[PDB]
Amino acid sequence: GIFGAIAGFIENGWEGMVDGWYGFRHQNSEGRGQAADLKSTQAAIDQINGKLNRLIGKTNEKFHQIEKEFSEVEGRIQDLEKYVEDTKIDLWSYNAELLVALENQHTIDLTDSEMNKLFEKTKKQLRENAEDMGNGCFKIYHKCDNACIGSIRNGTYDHDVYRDEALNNRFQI
Amino acid sequence: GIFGAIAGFIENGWEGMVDGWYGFRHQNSEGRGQAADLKSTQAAIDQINGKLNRLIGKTNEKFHQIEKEFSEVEGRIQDLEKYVEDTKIDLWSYNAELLVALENQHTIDLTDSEMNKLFEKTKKQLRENAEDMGNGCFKIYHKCDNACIGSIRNGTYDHDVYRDEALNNRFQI
Amino acid sequence: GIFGAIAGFIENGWEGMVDGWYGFRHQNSEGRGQAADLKSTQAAIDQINGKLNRLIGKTNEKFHQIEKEFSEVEGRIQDLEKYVEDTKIDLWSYNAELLVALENQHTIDLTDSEMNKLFEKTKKQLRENAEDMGNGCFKIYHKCDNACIGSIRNGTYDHDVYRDEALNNRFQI
Amino acid sequence: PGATLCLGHHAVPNGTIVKTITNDQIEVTNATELVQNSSIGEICDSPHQILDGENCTLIDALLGDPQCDGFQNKKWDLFVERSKAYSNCYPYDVPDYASLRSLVASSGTLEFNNESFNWTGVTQNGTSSACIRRSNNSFFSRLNWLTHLNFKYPALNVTMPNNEQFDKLYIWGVHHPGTDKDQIFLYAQSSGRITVSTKRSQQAVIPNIGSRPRIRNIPSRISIYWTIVKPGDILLINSTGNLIAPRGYFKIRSGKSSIMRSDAPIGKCNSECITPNGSIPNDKPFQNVNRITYGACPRYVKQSTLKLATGMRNVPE
Amino acid sequence: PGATLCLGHHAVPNGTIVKTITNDQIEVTNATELVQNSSIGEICDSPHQILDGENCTLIDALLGDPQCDGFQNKKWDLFVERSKAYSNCYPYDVPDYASLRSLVASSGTLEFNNESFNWTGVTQNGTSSACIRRSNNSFFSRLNWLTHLNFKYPALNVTMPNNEQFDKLYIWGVHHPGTDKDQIFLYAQSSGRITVSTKRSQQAVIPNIGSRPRIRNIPSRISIYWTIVKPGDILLINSTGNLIAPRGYFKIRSGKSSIMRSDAPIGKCNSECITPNGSIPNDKPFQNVNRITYGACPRYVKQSTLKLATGMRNVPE
Amino acid sequence: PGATLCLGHHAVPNGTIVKTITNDQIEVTNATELVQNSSIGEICDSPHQILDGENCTLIDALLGDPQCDGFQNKKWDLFVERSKAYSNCYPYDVPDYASLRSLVASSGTLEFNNESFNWTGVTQNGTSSACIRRSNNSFFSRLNWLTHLNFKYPALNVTMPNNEQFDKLYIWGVHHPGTDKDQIFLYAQSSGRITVSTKRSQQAVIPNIGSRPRIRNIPSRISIYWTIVKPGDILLINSTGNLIAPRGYFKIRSGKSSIMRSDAPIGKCNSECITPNGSIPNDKPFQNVNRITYGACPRYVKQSTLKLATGMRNVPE
Ligand SMILES: *[C@@H]1O[C@H](CO)[C@@H](O[C@@H]2O[C@H](CO)[C@@H](O[C@@H]3O[C@H](CO)[C@@H](O)[C@H](O)[C@@H]3O)[C@H](O)[C@H]2NC(C)=O)[C@H](O)[C@H]1NC(C)=O
Ligand SMILES: *[C@@H]1O[C@H](CO)[C@@H](O[C@@H]2O[C@H](CO)[C@@H](O[C@@H]3O[C@H](CO)[C@@H](O)[C@H](O)[C@@H]3O)[C@H](O)[C@H]2NC(C)=O)[C@H](O)[C@H]1NC(C)=O
Numbered sequence A, B, C: 001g002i003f004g005a006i007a008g009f010i011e012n013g014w015e016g017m018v019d020g021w022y023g024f025r026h027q028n029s030e031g032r033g034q035a036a037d038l039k040s041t042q043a044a045i046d047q048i049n050g051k052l053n054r055l056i057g058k059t060n061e062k063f064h065q066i067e068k069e070f071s072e073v074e075g076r077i078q079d080l081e082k083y084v085e086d087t088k089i090d091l092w093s094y095n096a097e098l099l100v101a102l103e104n105q106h107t108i109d110l111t112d113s114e115m116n117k118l119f120e121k122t123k124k125q126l127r128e129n130a131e132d133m134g135n136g137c138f139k140i141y142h143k144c145d146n147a148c149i150g151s152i153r154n155g156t157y158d159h160d161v162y163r164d165e166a167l168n169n170r171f172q173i
Numbered sequence D, E, F: 001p002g003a004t005l006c007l008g009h010h011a012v013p014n015g016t017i018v019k020t021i022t023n024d025q026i027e028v029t030n031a032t033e034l035v036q037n038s039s040i041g042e043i044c045d046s047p048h049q050i051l052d053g054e055n056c057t058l059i060d061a062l063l064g065d066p067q068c069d070g071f072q073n074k075k076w077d078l079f080v081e082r083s084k085a086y087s088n089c090y091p092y093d094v095p096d097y098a099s100l101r102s103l104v105a106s107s108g109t110l111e112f113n114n115e116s117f118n119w120t121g122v123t124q125n126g127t128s129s130a131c132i133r134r135s136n137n138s139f140f141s142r143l144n145w146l147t148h149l150n151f152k153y154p155a156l157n158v159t160m161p162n163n164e165q166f167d168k169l170y171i172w173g174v175h176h177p178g179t180d181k182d183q184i185f186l187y188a189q190s191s192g193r194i195t196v197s198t199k200r201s202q203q204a205v206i207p208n209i210g211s212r213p214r215i216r217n218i219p220s221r222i223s224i225y226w227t228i229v230k231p232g233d234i235l236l237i238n239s240t241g242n243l244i245a246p247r248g249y250f251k252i253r254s255g256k257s258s259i260m261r262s263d264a265p266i267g268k269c270n271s272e273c274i275t276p277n278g279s280i281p282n283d284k285p286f287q288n289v290n291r292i293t294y295g296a297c298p299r300y301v302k303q304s305t306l307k308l309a310t311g312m313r314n315v316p317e
């Protein structure tokens, strides 16, 4: 939420992208296609797995404790045993509630962040050859076939190769 | 703070904007004016109300507990009753202190975020027709009367209509 | 991490920058050089010192409490004294663990933020006279001697002075 | 020509300072207080059932001190004990007083059922000038002071089965006369002895003859004991003197009842959260009014104020 | 012509609702449950050493109620007491029963070492029809009922030094006969008295003759006491009647042992975390199965569910 | 031509690994330790008032064991009890020893005021070879061993009003002789009895004659009791033998005092936080030195180290 990509300038997600969490859809003279981006996907997954590693399979051993159920009325000492336990449980229940709310806000934000980083990286790569359409899409102002699109996805696109063509198209009248 | 708009590249707030939290000021050939942006304002308010919903009107019922004031010296059991209560109060006081510090940092950041999102949205909308002056303002390189400014605020501005005019003005010598 | 500058689009840090946390390296017709940016450095330091002020030198006084070691087996009351203390220690150990994990994530993010803010500020300052090379560097499309570079660092660069020269170089064929 | 379009945010002339993770004083446009710091100074009589002890402690209302006769069989969610309270019957003590007070407080009722114990052989209904009811010598309403009959006190062996489906709470006592002369005058023998048993318990008490510092001119004492009897179990009382006999049992319940020490007046008003200082609003999550509370209450903390930002950073012109 | 390149993220048709700091219901692509809410309903016999008390409470196994003879000298990590348990020996009580139960539970062993006390002058091995072992009148296995010998009960003054390098736990008792007739018949004198001392302690008990409500037709009682003797210290027993003598000592250890009340069957399975409802998986950090636990367990909380997002916000087409 | 301007951040060749929400090992440029893990091994004598018990426990200094005479009337913030401590007076026990120790520790003073009790009829100042002071038979300094006078011990009925504006703490005891011969020799009658009462309390004790395992050749014992007397109240002592009489009262205060068991030497230094291991610096918020602390101390946690990042992520060349 905090970067404003997911549920933001990206109108919605793609249910048909089943091999990654972030990716690219293109249209060019050869067709229209989709490819997952592995690095952004892995970055988000690794961070979420980091949270899980802290929370799952990490329990604490306790042995003999105090009694917590009572068959006879006793007064002062039993009042204290009950109060100690009730106090403990409320503090742990608070910790658990807060942990989940904080972690979840952060998970939504970090996943939004990874979407934003990939968008920004792509934008810089394209230099003067494309314009940001405001919805996560770039209009690319030159012929850009499948190999060309692939070079952008693979981070090997050479903006200089297309710059003359793109500037001519962009700054036309 | 973390996005760097509020108390950042936006020099200061506007005390004269009383009908929203974020908005637009313009100058054009017809005058100078101000309009609140409702969507960004509501987004910030809704998130803060979300925090309030978690904190306000949500108290826990407790009934018979332990005694917490004592008229006679007793030793061991009373030491334990006092220590249990002191321990509880310090843990709750810690939770309360941390909650406020964390929430407040986050509220400052989310409000900064909403300012930044509205700025970014506007920037993209203007495409090649305006330049970022670095202080939250755009220099718009074409005649842009009240209806024109209104179209930008309302998200219906058609950059193509003005592009020839703007490029001629921008890339002049 | 969340802005994607440090350990992100900035490939690595500079061990040779020993007079600040953020800064500028340039190359021009007079040589190549480095200068720390004081304001961004101070902003990061001040925030970290804010955390330290909350944590260091702020301990709580406690006096007579309960016993916590025992030389004889006693049963019920001693079980309760031990359980109260064990409960307390686990809750404080949890608070300490969480505090460090949360603060550290946030410290990494705020320092990433300050790097990003300085990059964005510089980018806006340069207007149409430079292009973002995607790795934290700007290609500046005009002669920019030491005084010129210094004006950018000092926030006094006048983009209008160089604009004709830069546009001619940028939009060449 | 062209135009300029500037993005911005509001500010106020009257911002509020809050604390954050990185700064102890940062001004925001608005905030709200999370610590309730005041009471209206009265304990609202709604929505919890309040019982004002007035001059009577719960234990005095239990035993049946004459000035507490109005309390018979009453119930409460919160029994309020006043600092002005005082006893005006036969002087007594209760070993583990705090526990009897607590269990009765938590049970939340003074409902009492009389039972017909067989006290053949002794004189019942002993009275004292230290315990006046309606201008006459009297005694605790719920207790039966047994004395010799015709200068004999035969060994009592009295039984009372619990054939109910609920538990019974029995309150009884042992009299410690101030002199041997008194012991003989009351019980017709030099040494009394009391054993109260069930199938799962036994309480044996030896009277202690001797002077204590006089209370309202009385050097003797009564020590109060209690016994809970489950369904299917049986109360057995064995005494050869000095027994202060129960007249029946109290019902013992479970639920949300308690007791609080406070001198705040009871008001005709409605408030969920009670403290000894008075009722407090419960909208805020925390409070620094009192660590003692009853009902749906904010949690007690040490801070006098905690301000939650409800607006952005305030950056005035 | 040219091309379009759009950046995007996945979505699912079946998102899950989670809570955050700013919204109580936001849909994400996936989440995982952090509260364990179920048990398989059996207490797995591994990896902790389980001892099923069956018909015997720990105290009955300690004293040596005949039906608990199978428990002699056994050890446990977790002793499991069943609600069906019952005593079938001489009726007894234990002042501070909860403490004796706890210290024995925590010690985790019933290892018993016999010792040769010098009971010259009295008759040993008293038996009762209220405590049948192998169809004959018997008694607690670990206790020695002493009675008169030739109508005399000489004052006992018996010593037992701890010359070991470990502590000794002694269990002993006082008999309260139901009548004077019984007192005389057993102990040949009207009043018994018991003092058990060490260098650092003394426990003096006066027998209380009198009828209690009959248990399995028995109006008398035995009260059970315990004494710990350190190395270099000495057990001293002084009695003139009514002593229920120890036959030796229990070893007392320290470690991870405990006791739990549960009616869940023991299963042949392996689970680290035990609750009275049965063993529970311990992968999740929290659980709402029971506040009573033993082993490496999730922490008990009040919530029935807490969903941790494991995916981004879900924004369907 | 033109120019290049690159933005960047520093790095160090010696980064430190910290934990975060999403990664258990990430390197930053600098960090600081939040867990204090060491002590200098001495308890600094400043700024709290330290009283080193040396050979004396607090209770021995209270009663007035001869080797503890130097402690008379002293005050402390922290009384330090040494493991080497030992008693060298008449052997005694204190029922609820831990409570007497605690209340005296918390009061923080041994200030004692003598009072002139009326012991007409008996012999005062009884001494013992088990309690040597200045090479002569003596007794606890604060206690008065009463014995027969001319082979009579008349029933004592002695009063002492508290007409002060502060509470009085009385320490007294009961002597348990080892034989009937001793009982008669000391008290001139077979059975003693002690009742100590106020308006709001009564403590009745029956002496127990009999041998205990000898301590420093002594088979008898004294049991120590205490009584607090409020202003307007009165101490009443009734005895027919075996009374170990108080000589006056201790003042009882409230404040920040305590007691700690430690063998760490006292040093001439200044440190706010004390643990049994020695004083520890209190700059860090947490510590793993000891769960036992006194003063302004870091909070005890289980972790041995918690590193707080004080720099950005370290990304070396
Ligand atoms: C043991 O000593 C106590 C303390 O002296 C004796 O108690 C005192 O007994 C006297 C004489 O009966 C009481 O005097 C009365 O005082 C009241 C009220 O002030 C007055 O109205 C009467 O006219 C009478 O003078 C006195 O109150 C009482 N003092 C206390 C503290 O209780 C006690 O009698 C002695 N025990 C024996 C068995 O002798
Ligand atoms: C004091 O009172 C109690 C209560 O009445 C007396 O105990 C009762 O004694 C009778 C007569 O021995 C017992 O009767 C027996 O009952 C059993 C089982 O129901 C039956 O099998 C025998 O044939 C016999 O009838 C009765 O159980 C018993 N009641 C209780 C509650 O224990 C007690 O004897 C009296 N004490 C003295 C010293 O007289």
Ligand SMILES: *[C@@H]1O[C@H](CO)[C@@H](O[C@@H]2O[C@H](CO)[C@@H](O[C@@H]3O[C@H](CO)[C@@H](O)[C@H](O)[C@@H]3O)[C@H](O)[C@H]2NC(C)=O)[C@H](O)[C@H]1NC(C)=O
Pocket (backbone or CB within 6 Å): E157, E158, E159, E234, F178, F179, F211, F212, F213, F214, F217, F219
């Ligand atoms: C009941 O039994 C105990 C234990 O046997 C008796 O106590 C013992 O009494 C003897 C004889 O007086 C003590 O002997 C003395 O030992 C000391 C130190 O070792 C020595 O210096 C003397 O010369 C003398 O021999 C022995 O210490 C003592 N043992 C214990 C454990 O206290 C006790 O006397 C018996 N009670 C009665 C009333 O007979």
Ligand SMILES: *[C@@H]1O[C@H](CO)[C@@H](O[C@@H]2O[C@H](CO)[C@@H](O)[C@H](O)[C@H]2NC(C)=O)[C@H](O)[C@H]1NC(C)=O
Pocket (backbone or CB within 6 Å): D054, D055, D067
């Ligand atoms: C509670 O006890 C006080 C004190 O005895 C009672 O106040 C007395 O009331 C009578 C009748 O009005 C006056 O004559 C006395 O002067 C009062 N005594 C004092 C010392 O103030 C009060 O009535 C009792 N309250 C109830 C409701 O029983």
Ligand SMILES: *[C@@H]1O[C@H](CO)[C@@H](O[C@@H]2O[C@H](CO)[C@@H](O)[C@H](O)[C@H]2NC(C)=O)[C@H](O)[C@H]1NC(C)=O
Pocket (backbone or CB within 6 Å): E054, E055, E067
């Ligand atoms: C635990 O006690 C119960 C109750 O006495 C025992 O169950 C009895 O078993 C015998 C033999 O099969 C039956 O004849 C009885 O009918 C049962 N009694 C009842 C009331 O069910 C059981 O055997 C005991 N368990 C162990 C292992 O000793």
Ligand SMILES: *[C@@H]1O[C@H](CO)[C@@H](O[C@@H]2O[C@H](CO)[C@@H](O)[C@H](O)[C@H]2NC(C)=O)[C@H](O)[C@H]1NC(C)=O
Pocket (backbone or CB within 6 Å): F054, F055, F067
């Ligand atoms: C504390 O007690 C010990 C043990 O009695 C005392 O140490 C003795 O000191 C004397 C005099 O120097 C020596 O002759 C003994 O050999 C010591 N005994 C032992 C066993 O070491 C010590 O003096 C006492 N401390 C104080 C200050 O009273």
Ligand SMILES: *[C@@H]1O[C@H](CO)[C@@H](O)[C@H](O)[C@H]1NC(C)=O
Pocket (backbone or CB within 6 Å): D012, D014, D015, D016, D029, D030, D031
């Ligand atoms: C600021 O002042 C106005 C006018 O009195 C007031 O209504 C408003 O609540 C104030 N803001 C706060 C909450 O500080």
Ligand SMILES: *[C@@H]1O[C@H](CO)[C@@H](O)[C@H](O)[C@H]1NC(C)=O
Pocket (backbone or CB within 6 Å): B052, D030, D031, D032, D310
């Ligand atoms: C300040 O915030 C609180 C809580 O959101 C709100 O009730 C109040 O109206 C606010 N004041 C203003 C002037 O917005």
Ligand SMILES: *[C@@H]1O[C@H](CO)[C@@H](O)[C@H](O)[C@H]1NC(C)=O
Pocket (backbone or CB within 6 Å): D124, D125
């Ligand atoms: C005892 O007093 C009560 C209460 O006034 C009365 O009802 C009862 O008749 C009296 N019993 C006897 C035997 O005097």
Ligand SMILES: *[C@@H]1O[C@H](CO)[C@@H](O)[C@H](O)[C@H]1NC(C)=O
Pocket (backbone or CB within 6 Å): D037, D038, D039, D276, D277, D288, D289, D290
């Ligand atoms: C409530 O009463 C307590 C106890 O007397 C006192 O400490 C506190 O100041 C009171 N608080 C308020 C807000 O009246």
Ligand SMILES: *[C@@H]1O[C@H](CO)[C@@H](O)[C@H](O)[C@H]1NC(C)=O
Pocket (backbone or CB within 6 Å): E012, E014, E015, E016, E029, E030, E031
């Ligand atoms: C969504 O549905 C699929 C198909 O049944 C299932 O495999 C997947 O786990 C579901 N996602 C979740 C975890 O809700």
Ligand SMILES: *[C@@H]1O[C@H](CO)[C@@H](O)[C@H](O)[C@H]1NC(C)=O
Pocket (backbone or CB within 6 Å): A052, E030, E031, E032, E310
């Ligand atoms: C949902 O998340 C959990 C934890 O990461 C994982 O085990 C499970 O496979 C996830 N489901 C899907 C469909 O990704």
Ligand SMILES: *[C@@H]1O[C@H](CO)[C@@H](O)[C@H](O)[C@H]1NC(C)=O
Pocket (backbone or CB within 6 Å): E124, E125
């Ligand atoms: C007492 O009974 C035990 C257990 O059967 C037996 O071993 C021992 O010989 C008996 N002792 C005497 C003196 O009868």
Ligand SMILES: *[C@@H]1O[C@H](CO)[C@@H](O)[C@H](O)[C@H]1NC(C)=O
Pocket (backbone or CB within 6 Å): E037, E038, E039, E276, E277, E288, E289, E290
């Ligand atoms: C476990 O048993 C407790 C106590 O009887 C009961 O409250 C709870 O419902 C049970 N929980 C489960 C998951 O079976």
Ligand SMILES: *[C@@H]1O[C@H](CO)[C@@H](O)[C@H](O)[C@H]1NC(C)=O
Pocket (backbone or CB within 6 Å): F012, F014, F015, F016, F029, F030, F031
């Ligand atoms: C890194 O090394 C230098 C030189 O020894 C040292 O001064 C500095 O403190 C080190 N950084 C840290 C704190 O690890």
Ligand SMILES: *[C@@H]1O[C@H](CO)[C@@H](O)[C@H](O)[C@H]1NC(C)=O
Pocket (backbone or CB within 6 Å): C052, F030, F031, F032, F310
């Ligand atoms: C590491 O951080 C701490 C706390 O800010 C500081 O005292 C120390 O000087 C730092 N070291 C360096 C080399 O910056």
Ligand SMILES: *[C@@H]1O[C@H](CO)[C@@H](O)[C@H](O)[C@H]1NC(C)=O
Pocket (backbone or CB within 6 Å): F124, F125
């Ligand atoms: C008792 O001993 C004390 C302390 O030495 C002394 O002052 C006092 O005179 C003695 N009293 C009597 C009556 O012997």
Ligand SMILES: *[C@@H]1O[C@H](CO)[C@@H](O)[C@H](O)[C@H]1NC(C)=O
Pocket (backbone or CB within 6 Å): F037, F038, F039, F276, F277, F288, F289, F290
């Ligand atoms: C302090 O003493 C305790 C208790 O003996 C011991 O466990 C611990 O190791 C000591 N800690 C330090 C840092 O000396």
